[PDB]
Design an enzyme around this catalytic site. Structure first.
Site, PDB file in Angstrom:
ATOM      1  N   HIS A  61       0.805  -1.220   0.000  1.00 26.05           N
ATOM      2  CA  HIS A  61       0.000   0.000   0.000  1.00 26.05           C
ATOM      3  C   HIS A  61       0.838   1.270   0.000  1.00 26.05           C
ATOM      4  O   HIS A  61       0.308   2.340  -0.345  1.00 26.05           O
ATOM      5  CB  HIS A  61      -0.915   0.052   1.235  1.00 26.05           C
ATOM      6  CG  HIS A  61      -1.718  -1.193   1.451  1.00 26.05           C
ATOM      7  ND1 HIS A  61      -2.822  -1.512   0.689  1.00 26.05           N
ATOM      8  CD2 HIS A  61      -1.592  -2.187   2.361  1.00 26.05           C
ATOM      9  CE1 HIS A  61      -3.331  -2.657   1.109  1.00 26.05           C
ATOM     10  NE2 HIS A  61      -2.604  -3.086   2.125  1.00 26.05           N
ATOM     11  N   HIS A  91       6.003   7.178   5.859  1.00 21.37           N
ATOM     12  CA  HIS A  91       5.626   6.719   4.532  1.00 21.37           C
ATOM     13  C   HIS A  91       5.059   7.910   3.776  1.00 21.37           C
ATOM     14  O   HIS A  91       4.846   8.991   4.335  1.00 21.37           O
ATOM     15  CB  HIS A  91       4.600   5.584   4.623  1.00 21.37           C
ATOM     16  CG  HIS A  91       3.328   6.021   5.279  1.00 21.37           C
ATOM     17  ND1 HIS A  91       3.136   5.966   6.642  1.00 21.37           N
ATOM     18  CD2 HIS A  91       2.224   6.625   4.772  1.00 21.37           C
ATOM     19  CE1 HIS A  91       1.955   6.486   6.939  1.00 21.37           C
ATOM     20  NE2 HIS A  91       1.378   6.900   5.823  1.00 21.37           N
ATOM     21  N   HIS A  93       2.184   9.129   0.439  1.00 23.06           N
ATOM     22  CA  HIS A  93       1.093   8.909  -0.493  1.00 23.06           C
ATOM     23  C   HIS A  93       1.376   9.775  -1.713  1.00 23.06           C
ATOM     24  O   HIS A  93       1.861  10.905  -1.572  1.00 23.06           O
ATOM     25  CB  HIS A  93      -0.243   9.326   0.137  1.00 23.06           C
ATOM     26  CG  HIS A  93      -0.514   8.668   1.457  1.00 23.06           C
ATOM     27  ND1 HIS A  93      -1.270   7.525   1.580  1.00 23.06           N
ATOM     28  CD2 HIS A  93      -0.091   8.966   2.708  1.00 23.06           C
ATOM     29  CE1 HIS A  93      -1.305   7.159   2.856  1.00 23.06           C
ATOM     30  NE2 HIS A  93      -0.603   8.020   3.564  1.00 23.06           N
ATOM     31  N   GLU A 103      -3.166  13.696   0.420  1.00 20.73           N
ATOM     32  CA  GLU A 103      -4.391  13.302   1.118  1.00 20.73           C
ATOM     33  C   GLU A 103      -5.099  14.537   1.673  1.00 20.73           C
ATOM     34  O   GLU A 103      -6.229  14.854   1.282  1.00 20.73           O
ATOM     35  CB  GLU A 103      -4.055  12.272   2.198  1.00 20.73           C
ATOM     36  CG  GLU A 103      -3.544  10.979   1.577  1.00 20.73           C
ATOM     37  CD  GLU A 103      -3.727   9.798   2.462  1.00 20.73           C
ATOM     38  OE1 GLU A 103      -3.324   9.876   3.644  1.00 20.73           O
ATOM     39  OE2 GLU A 103      -4.268   8.784   1.967  1.00 20.73           O
ATOM     40  N   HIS A 116       3.947  11.272   5.741  1.00 16.70           N
ATOM     41  CA  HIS A 116       3.395  11.052   7.074  1.00 16.70           C
ATOM     42  C   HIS A 116       4.451  10.438   7.976  1.00 16.70           C
ATOM     43  O   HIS A 116       4.900   9.311   7.735  1.00 16.70           O
ATOM     44  CB  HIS A 116       2.195  10.109   7.006  1.00 16.70           C
ATOM     45  CG  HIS A 116       1.014  10.733   6.341  1.00 16.70           C
ATOM     46  ND1 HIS A 116      -0.049  10.017   5.827  1.00 16.70           N
ATOM     47  CD2 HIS A 116       0.743  12.038   6.109  1.00 16.70           C
ATOM     48  CE1 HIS A 116      -0.913  10.868   5.298  1.00 16.70           C
ATOM     49  NE2 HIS A 116      -0.448  12.096   5.442  1.00 16.70           N
ATOM     50  N   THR A 195      -5.379   7.242   7.783  1.00 20.97           N
ATOM     51  CA  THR A 195      -6.026   7.371   6.481  1.00 20.97           C
ATOM     52  C   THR A 195      -6.076   6.070   5.704  1.00 20.97           C
ATOM     53  O   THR A 195      -6.578   6.059   4.575  1.00 20.97           O
ATOM     54  CB  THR A 195      -5.353   8.444   5.618  1.00 20.97           C
ATOM     55  OG1 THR A 195      -4.056   7.994   5.243  1.00 20.97           O
ATOM     56  CG2 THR A 195      -5.285   9.788   6.348  1.00 20.97           C
ATOM     57  N   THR A 196      -5.569   4.984   6.282  1.00 14.90           N
ATOM     58  CA  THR A 196      -5.698   3.643   5.745  1.00 14.90           C
ATOM     59  C   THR A 196      -6.465   2.785   6.733  1.00 14.90           C
ATOM     60  O   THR A 196      -6.377   3.008   7.948  1.00 14.90           O
ATOM     61  CB  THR A 196      -4.318   3.013   5.515  1.00 14.90           C
ATOM     62  OG1 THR A 196      -3.518   3.159   6.698  1.00 14.90           O
ATOM     63  CG2 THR A 196      -3.637   3.688   4.366  1.00 14.90           C
TER      64      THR A 196
HETATM   65 ZN   LIG Z   1      -0.301   8.004   5.596  1.00 14.27          ZN
END
Ligand SMILES: [Zn+2]
Ligand SMILES: CC(=O)Nc1cccc(CN)c1
Length: 257
Positions: A61, A91, A93, A103, A116, A195-196
């Site tokens: 992911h 990590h 996005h 995000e 993040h 957010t996951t």
């Molecule tokens: Zn994140």
């Protein structure tokens, strides 16, 4: 299993994770004119000088750079926070195109990517217990725009070839996350969630106002990762972002006027 495709993406997550429709979901749009300067907010205290990075993992992911969180080596405090929060991983996005990927948005603007840095509140002893608490986590969010290269990101970019597919990891010691920060630590803050999936509502979000610049080549290399495992059909790891969710009964506060 959940993911970012048409058949398993953010619009489907609520079926297995009903909190996806909860009261403090993330990300959100940051409406800059309605956020409120709060002069009681303290400067953010980022203490990363003793950070011990260990490993980088493609989890299917995103990729996570993981840290030793068995002592107070890399900690976030001050700002809106009470107490001490330890860095466990960071990590990103990102998008398939430079015009999307973040995000959080700012006055509906989407950045090319978002970093993040995930921290857990040491008064709960371990990450697993922290994510059972409404103040268990603090996530420092940093926007990425495409322009000049970020030198402190290049070591991350140059290991990605070795973790192309889900489940691959590589040793990643002696990485200094201070090289990913912008100059200013001015921020917005609000209460939200991961957010996951499992979308847990544990997070004090601290989103920095100043983006970092990365080069087109750096973000292009993020987009060569794969969501799939080795020996499976290739699905490029792009557009691994959740869109903005309803703000509901929340206030976004600004540390700056
Ligand atoms: Zn994140
Ligand atoms: C799945 C999981 O708990 N991973 C992880 C990552 C980084 C550090 C640690 C140790 N707290 C654990």
């Amino acid at each position: 299993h959940w993911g970012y495709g048409k058949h398993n993406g953010p619009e489907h997550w609520h079926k297995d994770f009903p909190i996806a429709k909860g009261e403090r979901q993330s990300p959100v749009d940051i409406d800059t004119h309605t956020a409120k300067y709060d002069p009681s907010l303290k400067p953010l205290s980022v203490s990363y000088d003793q950070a011990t990075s260990l490993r980088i993992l493609n989890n299917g992911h995103a990729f996570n750079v993981e840290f030793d969180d068995s002592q107070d080596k890399a900690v976030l405090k001050g700002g809106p926070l009470d107490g001490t929060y330890r860095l466990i991983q960071f990590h990103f996005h990102w998008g398939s195109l430079d015009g999307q990927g973040s995000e959080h948005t700012v006055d509906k603007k989407k950045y090319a990517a978002e970093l993040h840095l995930v921290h857990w509140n040491t008064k709960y002893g371990d990450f697993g217990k922290a994510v059972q608490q409404p103040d268990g986590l603090a996530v420092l969010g940093i926007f990425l725009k495409v322009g000049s290269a970020k030198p402190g990101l290049q070591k991350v970019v140059d290991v990605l070839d070795s973790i192309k597919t889900k489940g691959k990891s590589a040793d990643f010691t002696n990485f200094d996350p201070r090289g990913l920060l912008p100059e200013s630590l001015d921020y917005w803050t609000y209460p939200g969630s991961l957010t996951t999936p499992p979308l847990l509502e544990c997070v004090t979000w601290i989103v920095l106002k100043e983006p970092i610049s990365v080069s087109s080549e750096q973000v292009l290399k993020f987009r060569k990762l794969n969501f799939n495992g080795e020996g499976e059909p290739e699905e490029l790891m792009v557009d691994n972002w959740r869109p903005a969710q309803p703000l509901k009964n929340r206030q976004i506060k600004a540390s700056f006027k």
